[PDB]
């Protein structure tokens, strides 16, 4: 009641780096709960896109550097509740995940929350009154620098002036969940 | 049936009794709440702190039963009263059935039970609907109603955890404080209250 659930994921790299999502993520990602999906891109094909549509009707997605679909936008700004949320894959920033670069983009887009991908390393942190999310790779695909990556994604629970961010990570045999909270100053 | 000289079982039974009286008496409910809260913040693994906290509520214990804090400091022989209150013959840590862990656990169960008595139907049903881990987290959500169950305030109370589901449910694994058996009995009480 009042809350909105936003799935944040990306960098699946299916099928050229992974054949699928981990069995445990598949099993837990059920339909009829998520309201919006913000995808950082590199799902890579339509097969993954049609899968996301099974999870929620409203799917938003930006272009990753390996995406087959050239129709996805570079970036996207979307308003959910009281939050303006920016979305960009993140290969455009050099060096990858740089805080000065991400900061510049937040101010460029004018967003409360900035979601980006590309590093395959999950992030959630407040910096200078604004919030920054990287869901990581939901498939744990290798990046340009590394294999041995932890599969992960994020669910935001948005209500009023407050966003509760849950990070799901497959570590050993369990999906561990962490909860971080962010209030709009 | 046994032969134990210390007051371990006495305080356990006394707390049982004081709780029955408190079901009517509101002033006593609040006094007993404070007492139990003070026991729960204390580390049972630290025998000195635990003897001290039980010891400092002497006014409260004397009101119910003067025999709890009784020590017959006769002549110049035997132990001193100061020395008695810091010793095993007052309250012993290696008791086979009512050690300080067991009393700390018992006090946790009594604190939830104390606040359950006057709580509303929605609360009692939440106790019934939730599994043990969800239940522990639900008790934390109702603070101070069912006690101050939270990190810092109850010793051994764990950080809340979240189930890997969409969305996550809050859960708490503090079995060392509120055991699965305690929760089962808390549930039994909630049922009895709904049958009144």
Curated annotation (Swiss-Prot), chain A:
SUPFAM superfamilies: Metallo-dependent phosphatases. GO terms for molecular function: metal ion binding. NCBIfam families: yfcE (TIGR00040). InterPro entries: Calcineurin-like_PHP_lpxH (IPR024654), Metallo-depent_PP-like (IPR029052), Phosphodiesterase_MJ0936/Vps29 (IPR000979), Vps29 (IPR028661). Changing residue 65 to A/N: Loss of in vitro protein phosphatase activity. It is found in: Cytoplasm; Membrane; Endosome membrane; Early endosome. Ubiquitous. Highly expressed in heart, lung, placenta, spleen, peripheral blood leukocytes, thymus, colon skeletal muscle, kidney and brain. Its main location: cytoplasm. The gene is VPS29. This is Vacuolar protein sorting-associated protein 29. The keyword Disulfide bond does not apply. Changing residue 42 to A: Loss of in vitro protein phosphatase activity. Changing residue 155 to E: Impairs interaction with TBC1D5. Impairs interaction with VPS35L. GO terms for biological process: endocytic recycling; intracellular protein transport; retrograde transport, endosome to Golgi. The modification N6-acetyllysine is found at residue 53. It comes from Homo sapiens.
């Amino acid at each position: 009641a009042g809350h909105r659930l936003v799935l944040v994921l990306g960098d699946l790299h299916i099928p050229h780096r992974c054949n699928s999502l981990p069995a445990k993520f598949k099993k837990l990602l059920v339909p009829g709960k998520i309201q919006h999906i913000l995808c950082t891109g590199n799902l890579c094909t339509k097969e993954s896109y049609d899968y996301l549509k099974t999870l929620a009707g409203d799917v938003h997605i930006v272009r990753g550097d390996f995406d087959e679909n050239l129709n996805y936008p570079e970036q996207k700004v979307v308003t959910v509740g009281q939050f303006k949320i920016g979305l960009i894959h993140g290969h455009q920033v050099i060096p990858w995940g740089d805080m000065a670069s991400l900061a510049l983009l937040q101010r460029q887009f004018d967003v409360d929350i900035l979601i980006s991908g590309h590093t395959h390393k999950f992030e959630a942190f407040e910096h200078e009154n604004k919030f920054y999310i990287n869901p990581g790779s939901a498939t744990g695909a290798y990046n340009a620098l590394e294999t041995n990556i932890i599969p992960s994604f994020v669910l935001m629970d948005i209500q009023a002036s407050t966003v509760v961010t849950y990070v799901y990570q497959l570590i050993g045999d369990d999906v561990k969940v962490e909860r971080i909270e962010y209030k709009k100053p | 049936e046994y032969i134990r000289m210390a007051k371990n079982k006495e305080f356990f039974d006394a707390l049982e009794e004081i709780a029955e009286s408190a079901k009517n008496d509101e002033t006593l409910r609040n006094e007993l709440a404070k007492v139990l809260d003070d026991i729960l913040k204390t580390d049972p693994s630290d025998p000195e702190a635990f003897r001290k906290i039980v010891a400092e509520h002497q006014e409260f214990w004397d009101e119910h039963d003067p025999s709890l804090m009784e020590f017959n400091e006769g002549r110049f022989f035997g132990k001193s009263r100061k020395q008695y209150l810091k010793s095993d013959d007052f309250l012993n840590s290696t008791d086979p059935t009512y050690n300080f862990q067991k009393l700390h656990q018992f006090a946790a169960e009594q604190r939830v039970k104390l606040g359950l008595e006057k709580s509303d139907t929605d609360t009692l049903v939440a106790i019934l609907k939730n599994n043990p881990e969800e239940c522990r987290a639900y008790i934390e959500s109702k603070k101070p109603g069912l006690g101050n169950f939270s990190e810092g305030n109850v010793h051994g109370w764990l950080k809340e955890e979240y189930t890997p589901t969409i969305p996550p449910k809050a859960i708490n694994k503090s079995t060392g404080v509120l055991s699965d058996e305690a929760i089962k009995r808390i549930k039994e009480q909630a049922r009895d209250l709904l049958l009144l």
